């Protein structure tokens, strides 16, 4: 009988019934189908593989992201994506709650998995739930779409948001993600510290990757994340988040030190990012559902056959 | 600075100093009337010291240089007296001023100065220094055509062969063209070489050609003509000749006609045809050799007719001025349709034949044009050669309203060869020191490698010419943004306000202004080598008989260094040939054409070199001084007498020294002395 | 020998001499600097592209408005403007004349340009002498600062002035003003034709963008202009010109029946705009100076050696 | 006294001094050890046949490429095809000039050459200086790696570019090569095509082999080629040149027709390509190098001597 929050990131889809802890289930959120021909009976092999298995078995792939830079990009995909994961994972009824879901979907989730209600809430607004503040202007940065909403106690300003070795093979892709992981830090004062990065001593580590190959990147291994600030090195005009703001192990006392350069004087700019950051949204999301009393700002069933692809918003 | 009713005065208006006399000097107002006729008045307060110069020792009737005050004023107007009112002459140092007006033993064996000024006198020290120094003499006769330049090096010519033109129809035919402002305009540089034996007697002659205005041959700009060979050819040749050659009238000839002529005599043309068809008999062309160099031309003129169709990439879809240009010159037709619009390249090892698009094919197609013609040229002088102290007769420096890459070269030219002078005059002037005067040290100046520099030095206004012609994008628009992008920092080189003349050069006589427009295609002449190849295949005798990215300026530039080669080689002696009015008048000197004249061979900016410097004798320095030396306790003797005003002055006797007859003094002390006086 | 009156807006800065017509010269008044790295010899390639090339050859330049909401930012890319357009456009020299201009850009002209005088008339005067008229309230509103001054005859009012798809890309931008200016109209009734623009029938034009795409837009097609009144859309707190008046194909009598409603009743409004508006202005300064006798109102140069930085006013 | 263009490809490589038509030596680029045991006094062979020899005598060889998608494999081969190419061919001097070079090299050659400068241009932006365009997306592919090269006028886009019968023997391959040279040509409609190839009407062309053999190769002929778009066929998920533009006697009609359907509407797409384009590349250095005037941007040895293997780029 329980209510279950969904955030769809282009993530790492992660769900976990109305509290209190974490999503119950995390996945990289792919569907894969298999670029060769197989002959192993059965038939055995799958039409198309979702995450998890669909992470376990690359190679045989062509990883295909069903959602890209926001907006998805068909929701043939995006459905399956669900129906495997109410059905086959969470072992929940669809009639079991009302839902609640981050920023078509409210349609085909509507007519196909038939929940009594719903309502979606902006995933940069979650984010203030997490340490429980009500004040805040939030960076919230995913993969593969960055936010950065302003929002006072207790009513949020809608205008102030500004929006922003070969490895060829798109499964290869993941691995590149990998060493992305461990194997990176933004610096603090970068342009002086890549004449010292020149000189012998390593700010190398040397990660190993699956295979047997060990691939050793240094240097760029700091200039890589450092992109999210002058982000000229992609080709794309619009000033880093450094600048949209006031508009990693790196952050946040470089972007302090950035800050104060660019803030007026005399104020100050505490940063602060809790750790367990990744479910900070997810976190939020528990709090609303099971907290009085926004139940009354949905949008169920009778309500449906009236006005139905309005009114949502 | 007062002067009273009958002054001979200067007066320095609107720029120039006009000989003038004091009219009338009462009520504070001073009236002056010019020998020119002109009277100008003005408030006497206004009359500054000099501003208005006295005519110091006037002389109102040889040499330029013996003038006090040497300036232009002065130069116009001592040449006019001599010129109008006095036998004609006349030097300017080293230099044989010669003007133009109304239609030997004596200089023979004489020394330079003895004798009043005259060809001769240039021709006899050639002759003499050719022997006394065992070296090649040049007379370089400047000045632009008919200036008077063919009858000074007629005389130099007769008074060489005495003491020890027949061709000219036929170099005028090929090498001359009417221009806006002259109706036979040499558009080449020709060097005679007067040859002698051992004993120095003459024994023929060599002429060498440079300087080829290349772009004529294909474009010509507003009231211009091409080559008058070609208008000459088409108004003399026979009926039954200009049948067999498709030919008709100028006006249906793109190469004659895209300048918008009006001329309507042929007469003239037709008169040339007779004196060059009578020349090339005396030069001993057979009538076979000059009827092959007519269907040459007239395969030159219908090969300009040629059109291309832009198929894309582009093709020849005419049944003639193609048909006729290669029944003409005996070739295949579909071979030479092919290769008007197509490339050839050759690799390991096959034909690769790729498309040219049609501004490609017509710069291609011109770029033959002028290949075929400057290869007859070369041709035609072979022949006048094989017939037959050199004598090289080169335009001046040519400034109109509007200038564009043919008077750009010019000016180019005339840059070099007015550094030959310079560095010739300055080691003249050394010598005269040395055995001349005492002194400890000499310094040259006035060098003029900077504007050299500017106009043919990498990076300079032809290389970058160069380098926007070989880009596929380029324009004069871009070339021009160069230009100032590499030049507008440094030089010489100035860019107009209003972007309306284009960039400018000071040059040595005086700035002139390029405009753009033309200069990209008119440097461009890339021959394509299997146009070429087509020719070479075919025969009456005379075709074939013509033997990364090249372009018309570094051609003019190699053939200016060859020229400079040939005359450094040698001693050279300077002829300016001006033209006194623009009428052919009898003795009849129009001041204004007289000064642009004078200034464009180079005579102005020479003088006020030689000025650069004041002398006077003794008694006359003493004479105009005596106010000063009121004061002082003087001796019996003149030399004394201008030594102690002198001490005063200066009494390391660094700014004056007495000569054998004169004070010498600087300029700044005399401008101190006289503001005193 | 002529004078020259030269309007600098946020335009679209124009340019002719003392009458009679239009100006000889318009363009969209920009500076901007290549983004990117230059390898094609001469060296060619220009530091900045002024107008009008730098609106022809957008999408390899930052494009940098030289002035942005009536002061400008900076005297460096304005006085560039300057001494282009005067070199190298109008073909004008410095000493030509007495100039004549609208709003360290008077005393910057007056050491580089030497123009012998002076004299600055607002931007909103100018704009009745038009169609001649001696009375009456002007709106004048461009990019990016409107004004509302309020004249009669012939002395002037000084108190009661109130003054007021992923387009990711600066270049870009460009192209919105485009469909700006084509696709646009304002409605008479905007919260009634909000209702019915919902109905199928298109309200739509579909522009087509300079590259192949075909963009369709409707329905917000004259909701973003209405924007201009009830200014709340923006997030910003000053009433909309509807009642900064009081206090497109649309207007005037959107502007009409507007007013009507808040102006007191009885009273005959005519909202006269001429056609050919856009050069107003600019007809309005020639016949100015051309006019007699305000000559002698002039600050020429033996003046500005006295007073200098201040005596403009 | 002359300067040289050399450009290194897969090739075939090219040599020929600064301009003016087209290398003055092409060779196919390889060196070859005999795999055999040798007995005919002198002892007469040589220790590695470089070409052209080395293509000369096939079968007797183990060719080895010194270079191998895009990376060279060791410095070892490629110096000894230097050293014998500037020494034993063109007969010039190490010291005759500065050199320009395409893409441990340049130090390499600048120790053991002392060519006194250097410069190295990439190879794409030259193949634009052939018809000599400033404008253009240049799709370069030669064995044994191609690039797609966007350059407006006259900056360059730097991130917009995406880089992708027994016949045992090694050197037998030399002759599938030629096989492929006139034996080919690319389809229009490759499915439609493949129907009709199936007839007994012969695509079929008979070519003769070295030897004494007649080999008599059709279908395949012109499917082999074709992978080049829909490169599944190696294995490789990659999408095809086709796709990596927009994102033989075949092309480039094949690759219009191809792009028409996945390239926006109303749009004119010419696909303009030269004959004589294998030799593209070097029309473009010898324009280059014999132009004003970034002589000024080489590395001479007095600046190579302060930072050395950096500076470079």
Redesign the interface.
């Given at each position: 009988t329980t209510a279950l929050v969904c955030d769809n990131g282009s993530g790492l889809v992660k769900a976990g019934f109305a509290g209190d802890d974490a999503p119950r289930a995390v996945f990289p959120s792919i569907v894969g189908r298999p670029?060769?021909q197989g002959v192993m009976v059965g038939m055995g092999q799958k039409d198309s593989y979702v995450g998890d298995e669909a992470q376990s078995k690359r190679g045989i792939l062509?990883l295909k992201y069903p959602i890209e830079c926001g907006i998805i990009t068909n929701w043939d995909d995006m459905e399956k994506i669900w129906h495997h994961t109410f059905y086959n994972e969470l072992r929940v009824a669809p009639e079991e709650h009302p839902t609640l879901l981050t920023e078509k979907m409210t349609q085909i989730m509507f007519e196909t998995f038939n929940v009594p209600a719903m309502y979606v809430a902006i995933q940069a607004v979650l984010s203030l739930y997490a340490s429980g503040r009500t004040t805040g202007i939030v960076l919230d940065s995913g993969d593969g779409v960055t936010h950065n909403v302003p929002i006072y106690e207790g009513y949020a300003?809608?205008?102030?948001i500004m929006r922003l070795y070969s490895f060829?093979?798109?499964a290869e892709r993941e691995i590149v993600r990998d060493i992305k992981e461990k194997l990176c830090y933004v610096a603090l004062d970068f342009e002086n510290e890549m004449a010292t990065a020149a000189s012998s001593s390593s700010l190398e580590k040397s990660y190993e990757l699956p295979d047997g190959q060990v691939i050793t990147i240094g240097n760029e291994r700091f200039r890589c994340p450092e992109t999210l600030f002058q982000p000229?090195f992609?080709?794309?005009?619009?000033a880093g988040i450094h600048e949209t703001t006031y508009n990693y192990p790196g952050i946040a006392d470089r972007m302090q030190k950035e800050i104060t350069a660019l803030a007026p004087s005399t104020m100050k700019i505490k940063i602060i990012a809790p750790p367990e950051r990744k479910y900070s949204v997810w976190i939020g999301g528990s709090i609303l559902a099971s907290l009085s009393t926004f139940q009354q700002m949905w949008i169920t069933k009778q309500e449906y056959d009236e006005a139905g692809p309005?009114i949502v918003h | 600075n007062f002067f009273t009713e009958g002054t001979r005065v200067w007066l320095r208006e609107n720029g120039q100093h006009f000989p003038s006399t004091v009219n009338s000097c009462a009520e504070g107002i001073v009236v002056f009337r010019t020998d020119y006729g002109q009277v100008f008045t003005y408030k006497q307060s206004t009359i500054t010291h000099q501003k208005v110069t006295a005519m110091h020792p006037t002389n109102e009737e040889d040499d330029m240089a013996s003038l006090t005050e040497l300036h232009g004023g002065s130069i116009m107007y001592n040449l006019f007296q001599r010129y109008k009112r006095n036998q004609i002459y006349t030097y300017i140092g080293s230099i044989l001023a010669s003007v133009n007006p109304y239609q030997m033993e004596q200089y023979s064996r004489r020394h330079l100065g003895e004798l009043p000024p005259h060809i001769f006198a240039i021709a006899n020290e050639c002759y003499r220094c050719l022997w006394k120094r065992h070296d090649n003499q040049c007379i370089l006769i400047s000045g632009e055509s008919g200036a008077g330049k063919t009858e000074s090096t007629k005389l130099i010519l007769k008074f060489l062969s005495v003491i020890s033109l027949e061709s000219s129809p036929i170099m005028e035919a090929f090498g001359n063209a009417k221009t806006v402002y002259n109706n036979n305009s040499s558009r080449f540089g020709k060097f005679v070489q007067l040859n002698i034996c051992q004993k120095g007697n003459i024994q023929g002659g060599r002429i060498v050609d440079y300087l080829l205005e290349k772009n004529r041959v294909v474009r010509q700009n507003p009231g211009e003509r091409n080559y008058h060979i070609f208008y000459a050819l088409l108004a003399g040749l026979e009926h039954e000749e200009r049948e067999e050659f498709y030919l008709s009238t100028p006006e249906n000839y793109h190469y004659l006609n895209q300048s918008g002529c009006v001329e309507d005599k042929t007469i003239s043309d037709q008169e040339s045809f007779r004196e060059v068809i009578t020349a090339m008999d005396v030069m001993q062309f057979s009538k076979e050799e000059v009827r092959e160099v007519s269907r040459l031309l007239a395969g030159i003129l219908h090969l300009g007719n040629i059109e291309f169709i832009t198929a894309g990439g582009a093709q020849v879809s005419f049944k003639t001025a193609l048909g006729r240009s290669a029944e003409l010159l005996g070739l295949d037709p579909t071979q030479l349709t092919d290769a008007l619009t197509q490339r050839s390249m050759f690799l390991r090892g096959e034909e690769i034949l790729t498309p040219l698009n049609v501004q490609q094919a017509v710069d291609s197609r011109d770029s033959l044009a002028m290949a075929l013609y400057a290869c007859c040229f070369e041709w035609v002088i072979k022949k006048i050669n094989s017939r037959i102290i050199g004598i090289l007769d080169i335009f001046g420096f040519e400034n109109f309203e509007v200038n564009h890459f043919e008077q750009f070269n010019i000016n180019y030219a005339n840059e070099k060869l007015q550094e030959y002078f310079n560095k010739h005059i300055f080691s003249l002037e050394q010598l005269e020191y040395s055995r001349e005067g005492l002194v400890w040290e000499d310094i040259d100046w006035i060098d003029n490698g900077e504007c050299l520099d500017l106009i043919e030095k990498k990076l300079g206004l032809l290389a970058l010419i160069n380098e926007e012609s070989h880009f596929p994008q380029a324009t004069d628009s871009t070339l021009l943004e160069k230009l100032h992008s590499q030049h507008a920092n440094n030089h010489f080189y100035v860019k107009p306000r209003v972007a309306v003349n284009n960039f400018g050069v000071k040059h040595y006589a005086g700035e002139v202004q390029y405009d753009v427009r033309g200069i990209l295609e008119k440097n461009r002449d890339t021959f394509r080598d299997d146009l070429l190849n087509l020719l070479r295949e075919s025969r009456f005798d005379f075709i074939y008989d013509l033997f990364r990215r090249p372009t018309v300026s570094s051609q003019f530039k190699d053939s200016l260094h060859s020229l400079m080669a040939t005359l450094s080689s040698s001693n050279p002696f300077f002829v300016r040939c001006i033209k006194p009015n623009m009428q052919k008048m009898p003795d009849q000197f129009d001041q204004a054409v007289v000064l642009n004249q004078l200034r464009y061979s180079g005579m102005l900016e020479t003088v006020r070199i030689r000025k650069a410097a004041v002398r006077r004798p003794f008694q006359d320095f003493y004479k105009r001084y005596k106010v000063l030396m009121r004061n002082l306790a003087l001796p019996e003797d003149v030399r004394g007498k201008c030594t102690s005003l002198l001490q005063l002055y200066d009494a390391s006797n660094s700014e004056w020294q007495l000569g054998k007859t004169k004070v010498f003094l600087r300029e700044s002390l005399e401008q101190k002395l006289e503001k005193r006086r």
């Open positions: 670029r060769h062509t300003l809608p205008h102030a060829v093979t798109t000229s992609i080709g794309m005009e619009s309005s | -």
